[PDB]
Scaffold this motif. Structure first.
Motif: not given
Lengths: 56, 313
Positions: B206-211, B215-218, B224-225
């Protein structure tokens, strides 16, 4: 507005009162004054952060 | 060397372009939701003097259209707009078949099941909602949900035991068992609200991003992260690859495409560079979508344009 007659002619009484915005109550009105924008402030946001995914 | 090249540009909208969705069934038709309340279905004439014409404008919505997705067969579309209503269209005529009423605020995201059997929607009510495909409310996640706007919700593609995942404005990525609709685990980090979320086609990341701009990969299996990529400016939409191990990210005016193997940037898709004589110089980037051919990507901007980028060798 109330008239009051005395020994010489009438006097005129006029009383005006402002009701103190009882919210959800009935001593004043609800629906505060139009030029009364009001801001709330939250908390519990923390800057110390480490990417930990805790499970449940 | 694999490179990207600006093939052409599509016109016909009036406000921001917010979403782009392609189906693997029909490789010559695109859906584009915009802020002019319409959804344009394109006649993708592959020529080079132009590149596409709007084929039909799905109309009928009282505000911005925030999300759109094509069904698996190519005959239906699902849409979610800023009046709280969802709409199930017919890609042959129009004629919205079913509107999914029930919300108190704007509808931000929308997603379709693997077999097109359930529906999920996240809104500004801090409520995730599951729906039968007939237009009735199946289940509501009222609490244990996000405390702020639920900015995006997605299904996992796995037939192996099912996940749905949601990111919100409470800087959290929450993951749910789809059968039970309870929490599986949390994911903390991401200082700042979250704009997007996505699941790899292998259903493992799950590649999550935002303000925040990172971009973080879970990992959907280990809980885990894995790792973080600083995307630079800001993240609007993250999309994985259909036949590669890349990750396309929509930054403010640019698009950053990583090779995940050694976690290295492949390219920086910057448009033309006129000397904009004041202020924010470039029209920012809203959405992006990879074609099922894995050969061309479409990108929807904030200046009413939809640009194409072809992989060249």
């Amino acid at each position: 507005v109330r008239h009051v007659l005395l020994r010489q002619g009438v006097l005129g009484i006029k009383v005006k009162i402002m009701l103190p915005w009882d919210p959800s109550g009935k001593i004043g009105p609800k629906k505060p004054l139009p030029d009364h924008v009001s801001i709330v402030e939250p908390k519990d946001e923390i800057l110390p952060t480490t990417p930990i995914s805790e499970q449940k | 060397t694999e490179q990207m090249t600006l093939r052409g540009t599509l016109k016909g909208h009036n406000g921001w372009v917010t979403q782009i969705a392609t189906t693997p069934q029909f490789p010559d038709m695109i859906l584009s939701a915009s802020r002019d309340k319409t959804i344009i279905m394109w006649k993708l004439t592959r020529d080079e003097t132009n590149y596409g014409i709007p084929q039909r404008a799905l109309r009928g919505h009282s505000h911005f259209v925030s999300d759109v997705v094509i069904s698996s067969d190519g005959q239906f579309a699902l849409s979610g707009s800023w009046d709280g209503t969802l709409r199930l269209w017919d890609l042959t005529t129009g004629t919205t078949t079913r509107r999914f009423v029930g919300h108190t605020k704007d509808v931000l995201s929308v997603a379709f099941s693997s077999d097109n059997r359930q529906i999920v929607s996240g809104s500004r009510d801090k409520t995730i909602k599951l729906w039968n495909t007939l237009g009735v409310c199946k289940y509501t996640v009222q609490d244990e949900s996000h405390s702020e706007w639920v900015s995006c919700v997605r299904f996992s593609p796995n037939s192996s035991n099912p996940i749905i995942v949601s990111c919100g404005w409470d800087k959290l990525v929450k993951v749910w068992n789809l059968a039970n609709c309870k929490l599986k685990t949390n994911h903390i980090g991401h200082t700042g609200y979250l704009n997007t979320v996505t699941v790899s086609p292998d259903g493992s990341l799950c590649a999550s991003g935002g303000k925040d701009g990172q971009a973080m990969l879970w990992d959907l299996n280990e809980g885990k992260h894995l790792y973080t990529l600083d995307g630079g400016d800001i993240i609007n939409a993250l999309c994985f690859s259909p036949n590669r191990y890349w990750l396309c990210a929509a930054t403010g005016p640019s698009i950053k495409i990583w090779d995940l193997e050694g976690k290295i940037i492949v390219d920086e898709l910057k448009q033309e560079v006129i000397s904009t004589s004041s202020k924010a110089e470039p029209p920012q980037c809203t959405s992006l979508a990879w074609s099922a051919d894995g050969q061309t990507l479409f990108a929807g901007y904030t200046d009413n344009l939809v640009r194409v980028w072809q992989v060249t060798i």
